[PDB]
Symmetry: D2
Subunit: 484 residues, 4 copies
């Protein structure tokens, strides 16, 4: 587009970090290979670490995390030629002046028709340095609006409750416009999450069914086999609710429950997401079951409390089932089950829309229909229903109408961060967390979170690799999800 | 269960015929192999032809049409041991007395506890001899009710209009109870047709959608590659409407449109089928397109009028598209497109429930959802809907949630006549055409049929192997089915 | 019609009784005056009492209960000329032979073209003599079918539970066809009860709303100021459930809950009433509140237990609130509140269809819509809804769209028995309790009734003239009816 | 509440005019009497006319148009004491400086706690002087924001098509904020129009019915007995579409069709009105019938073309029926009939929501339900439905559930301008035409209007006092409104 006619500089701050090498640079590599970045793009790493050999770091460390190298015919050296590194602090104005000048040098070397350059700052940094970096960038590394735009990609956590998150947003207010800020929730870059809006509002079949008349229960599920060992106890102060429920699953919740937007423009969609989240009744201790994993039966995985970085009397939940209510006319009386756990029997992210029983004329010879959207693994959408048992026997059984992407489509689906970085470069804010959207999410869970920190909510043990605490399943059953 | 405790005699009248060897005996073979008939069942062929060698006829002719011989270790000789043949006329009382005595011999040889025997008479005969055979059987070959039941399986045609069919039913009235008569419409034995009732009324998902609020158009389609050559001009006096639309597709129509029945008992289901058929507005010349096939482009297939058994100025349609209206609150304003043709590009039987457009917010970037039930070939049910194009491109495309039986299920689906004969033996009348059900069907088409015979409806040519006359597609389009 | 061309004899058995003079003869008088009976009709009273002066009894006693004498110009003497009286027993065949002969004499005196005569037997008798009278009539007072019809009007009670009622029906089976029996439930002759079917199924507005998607709760209410004093303790063995709930309010229940009938013919309507009643979950002790009235506060009305004809430890309920569930897809989750009491603050029969809350955007500034059908007093139908407060204040209030019959229509509505007798003469069984309809009703309440007789259900006191026991209101509230 | 704590000055520009004396001052009088204005309010008339005696003008002319004088004991002299008059031009800055100073004098004389004063400018002036007056006020008669607000009440016409109206809005843009501008459409002050939003969204009964599943046709009707004589030909350049359809009836249209708003705040409501108007398909010549009134049959009223101020070959329509389509999922396929005419048989403003037929089981013995909202005369809301004919006859008839305000409520409903002026003083913009709302309305009708001016749409004659041209009724019938 017009992205090609003007210089483009992508600055990865914290380029020496975990996210940078595992997600950011690999996503940028894929975007380069698909012709989604300009050939003459400049990617500038920025961090406090001194690089003795930049070429070696790029070839050995960075390139080690690139995927799909062999299948498609894209040269790695050409992409690495676009990457520079630079050393500097995250607080001193002298270093942000140096950063600006390095960008200027790259912008002047741009050979295209138009002058100046567009600047994308990716903040792959810890929350402790966030505000200082935003102040330095705002003060001394902004392009003037006439010569190009500035966009900020920022990562979670965004505070740890309503109050802390609001303070953080207020510090950003005078530094950047909300247009310029792109808050990542990387689940919004996943294929099947991106398809929710199309599934709901492009299809009469689902439009007509998507309310309390037909829907009995909605379940949103997150499972991982991995534990929280080797983090350095970073998880202990966060917990499973702050880590995935407050952001990833609430984002999914909002997409599943919002009204039809006025258009497909970014703000019309985000307006509806905020609108519905403000109608969610805040979670409370009585309508949740918490869990903290213990050592596995086979002995391989040690317990949460055996991690040397966690205090011995920690309430930190690694597992949680919540029952939420959305108080409006579309959703009244429909229980929303949100569950998320680490150290479980499988890796899973799925959405289950369980419809009401058709009581007659089949009674107990049928069961509830269910729309299942599985985002990972093996992404698929399928509709569970009752049919006649094939053949001469005249009986019933449950079956599916299936769409499994790896069988139907001959394409490799990109990592979430490829979609999102691309959309940030296009200037589309649809799949990024707006300031008021973030506030609405924290208000749902903050009362519960504060209760948990005071030690008022019981946390149940479960062996790593198990399905979680037994009373989680009983809680789900009485909540209205008929498991079958 | 009680079928085993009393003798069972299945008499195939017209056993020397086309239907007998191709459908009847092969179906009985499959039922024997699946343990669905008693091991000591007696199958008695009856016709005017003299059999010089019964064993050879059975081994060479009959066994030639048996399928799945290698798949199971079911012995063919054991089944053929149960078959006898007998010569006799279709009108003389002396021969029906002989038939009775032959049955009596078989019944006496039954070794089980109870006395007498149940008798199933399969009338695989032309319509010319039908009433005479019914009179002979009624008069001189009935079991007394105390010693067993008598059931009559009878084949179409059942008259050629409302009047002729009513006369025929009135002749049967004093001979047999309606409970004893099992009128075949063999499409009701096909897997996907049997599944219609379960699909509609066991599933909230389809229950909620099954009315004029969500449905824009319903299309029922019958196609065959075969022509009507070599029949001896039997088709000329019948036509495509009488041959498949009045029976097969109207049966499907009734299942797709009926209200939810009071229970799953046979008469509760048949009541609903009759109820809805009486609400169908009779077809008329203005809302139909007729066709008669001509010679194929490649030259292999000759035209309908080249068959030496058809008169030269025949109006007989080999192709027809009808638009019907069902006048009730569920279906008001929903056009029903019934189409059926021979000498077309493919063999097909499918049902398409085309839903309304979701107008916003996708507009022309989505299209109508469609539930497709394909009964043959390669039986399947799938739901066409719009989804995001997989990958980085953020676009839409039409896809499916699919259930293809040959991929999902590892079972060979039976021929229609296996299911039906089995259900006749069980005494379940659900999938058999009731006397009033038949009358309701004739009333829909009779006014049109009489108009066609008077030469008042234009019949358009189309080359064999083509898709039919061009104005059939235009008629379908303006009728409200959006083809895409 | 053809009612005029053949003799008509209406025999009122138990003509000396309470029902006869208060309801039967007065209804017949009104029918005569409106030209609904033939001028030459014969009305024959039959009972054991000897009449010293028949003319005086007619002029003084019977005519005393006739209404609307002055407003319309109908002569009383002309009607009384059509009435005869006759003495006889209810068991002796000699007396039913005499009855037959008296009818024959009246039939021969008919001067019209056709011979014979139609006979309507009204059994205004106690249950103790019922079967004996039916046997005598069947044996010795039937018209032959060729010379006219015979119809039996019979009154409740029809047994006192499922078993007793079934025995009674089995005794009637060989005596009369179900076509000939017309079981009275006189609430089906009331204007607003007759209008239920039209209200529901002639109007799209109510058709679309009449299910669990829009309806939150349905309440059916019966109140009387009168007590049960002076009955001679007849009520004590019956109770409020048997007296009005099992029949009157269950009839109303069936009309409010049935599916749309296949046509407006009598059996199509009655089929639907039976169908839905068989889907009602039987009442149980936990979901009811019983009451028995005590002396009024002002002292005028004595308590139920002060009636000298009731035993001192009677459990007999004069008040009852029931919560019923109809288990089907139209009604799942919708509580049905049936309440009925004597010795209450007012006389009332009304039906309240309370719809769900529209939650947004008015919240607590609106309240549940409610359709109210009031059958008595001052029969009316009105729809309670929220509107803007009239004038400059921009607020909300609850108001009504009203149809009060005495204001809108300038007509006097007939007593229930005028409609019903007229419909019995026309041969329309729509508003008469069918044998299977009756059985379905008893099955709903019998388990509860037997529990009450064993003394297992608590009966609460309430002062006559009060609104009933306090915990009845609390039971109603938690059941889901929001009173406002 | 805070309106009392600061000075209030209401300036009526064009106070010598028709609107001022007939609507503006009388409305202000009513607001004074109901305690809705502060007792120490200042009302300042402003116009070019010189007033020889201000007290006489107030007492004789102005007070002549006040109503409800006797009904309350509200003193007229007290209100007139609050009115001043002042002479000045509409273009000279010297006069707007004088105006400012006169306001300042009144503000200083305010005795309450706070300083400054709020200023409401009512522009009761012709469109020719509009922009000049807005410029003068903006330049030299604004209160500074710290000392009070400024609000502008402005009257139609707002241009004569999309282009002219857009230019006008662009001239206002730099002079006033959209928050300060209150564009009058006085139909939004009428009781029954104000109640539309409450009727639709506070009631489950109407919420559930308000879409194409239940609604067959919506008709909005405007009729007047008065003609356009004596106006000086002012109407000729405007026509009925610009005069009432583009504004009054389109406002009603938007309220009847909008989605449920996110809240009851002004901008949430106005957003929905704009949203739906942008989905209305523009009117076109084929889907309209135009009329121009001729002399009445009785001779009293002369024709439109006999008015000496109209050119002889005028196409100006005094009557118009339009069929509009709203292209979204709520309204697809539902025809909207807008009709408006002068010189007709009656004065009427009503809204008719005609529902679909309930086809079974009553067929032609029922008819379409209809919700009727009548704003004038004799304001009422009623629901037309089918019921059993009262009494012994068992037939059907159409009746109503009625709410007639003059019978139900003992209150005199205010003129439209009382509500609106009051809401402007409160700062509630809900019932005022927003800039984008206005643009959306012009886009609906502009293509049609330009066609009419070019002389491409036929204009039919009709006698004054008649019901309009005959082919208007035929157009309505084929459009889908069943008149009965
Ligand atoms: N073939 C098929 O797949 C279908 C068949 N049907 C129906 O099933 C029935 C049987 O069909 P099909 O088997 O094709 O019929 P056929 O023409 O093969 O006749 C069946 C048998 O009946 C006897 N028969 C034939 N013509 C006469 C006659 N004029 N008078 C007396 N007997 C005669 C013959 O036996 P014999 O001379 O030895 O007595 C013959 O073997 C028919 O009613 C047909 O309409 C319906 C749909 C499809
Ligand atoms: N009358 C009604 O009910 C309705 C009115 N309206 C709108 O309200 C506004 C006022 O209407 P209305 O009161 O009938 O208007 P008028 O024609 O009565 O004019 C209003 C006042 O403005 C001044 N004026 C009139 N003509 C001119 C001119 N050519 N140049 C400068 N000043 C002039 C006069 O005062 P002076 O000469 O003393 O300065 C006059 O008293 C208009 O915009 C109209 O479209 C809309 C719908 C209905
Ligand atoms: O679709 P199927 O089961 O092969 O049956 C098709 C045949 O069905 C028969 O009933 C018709 O008479 C034939 O004309 C038709 O070809």
């Amino acid at each position: 587009p017009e992205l090609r006619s003007r210089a483009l500089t992508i600055v990865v701050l914290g380029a020496s970090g975990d996210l940078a090498k595992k997600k950011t640079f690999p996503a940028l590599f894929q975007l380069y290979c698909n012709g989604m970045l300009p050939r003459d793009v400049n990617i500038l790493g920025y961090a406090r670490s001194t690089m003795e050999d930049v070429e070696k770091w790029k070839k050995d460390t960075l390139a080690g995390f690139f995927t799909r190298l062999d299948e498609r015919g894209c040269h790695v050296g050409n992409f690495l030629r676009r990457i520079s590194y630079m050393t500097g602090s995250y607080d001193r104005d002298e270093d942000f002046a140096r950063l600006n000048e390095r960008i200027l040098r790259m912008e002047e070397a741009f050979q295209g028709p138009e002058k100046g350059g567009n600047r994308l700052f990716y903040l792959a940094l810890p929350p402790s340095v966030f505000v200082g970096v935003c102040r330095g960038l705002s003060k001394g590394a902004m392009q003037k609006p006439e010569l190009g735009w500035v966009r900020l990609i920022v990562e979670k956590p965004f505070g740890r409750d309503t109050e802390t998150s609001e303070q953080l947003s207020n510090q950003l207010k005078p530094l950047f416009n909300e247009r310029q800020v792109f808050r990542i929730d990387h689940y919004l870059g996943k294929e099947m999450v991106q398809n929710i809006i199309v599934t709901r509002f492009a299809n009469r079949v689902f439009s007509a069914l998507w309310n309390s008349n037909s829907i009995a229960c909605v379940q949103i599920t997150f499972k991982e086999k991995i534990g929280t060992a080797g983090r350095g106890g970073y998880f202990d102060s966060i917990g499973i609710i702050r880590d995935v429920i407050q952001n990833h699953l609430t984002q999914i919740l909002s997409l599943l429950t919002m009204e039809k937007p006025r258009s497909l423009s970014a703000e019309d969609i985000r307006d509806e997401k905020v609108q519905v989240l403000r109608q969610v009744v805040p979670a409370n201790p009585a309508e949740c079951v918490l869990g903290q994993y213990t050592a596995s039966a086979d002995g391989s995985t040690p317990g949460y409390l055996d991690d040397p970085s966690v205090p011995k009397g920690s309430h930190c939940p690694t597992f949680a089932v919540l029952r939420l209510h959305v108080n409006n006319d579309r959703w009244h009386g429909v229980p929303f089950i949100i569950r998320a756990g680490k150290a479980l029997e499988e890796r899973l992210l799925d959405i289950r829309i369980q419809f009401k029983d058709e009581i007659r004329p089949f009674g107990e010879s049928t069961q509830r229909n269910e729309l299942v959207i599985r985002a990972q693994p093996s992404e698929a959408m399928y509709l569970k229903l009752t049919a006649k048992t094939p053949g001469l026997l005249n009986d019933t059984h449950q079956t599916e109408l299936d769409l499994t992407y790896e069988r139907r489509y001959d394409v490799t689906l990109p990592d979430a961060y490829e979609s999102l970085i691309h959309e940030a470069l296009l200037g589309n804010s649809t799949n990024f967390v707006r300031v008021d959207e973030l506030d609405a999410a924290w208000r749902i869970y903050t009362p519960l979170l504060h209760a948990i920190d005071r030690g008022e909510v019981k946390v149940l043990p479960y062996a790593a690799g198990s399905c979680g605490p037994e009373e989680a399943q009983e809680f789900i059953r009485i909540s209205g999800y008929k498991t079958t």
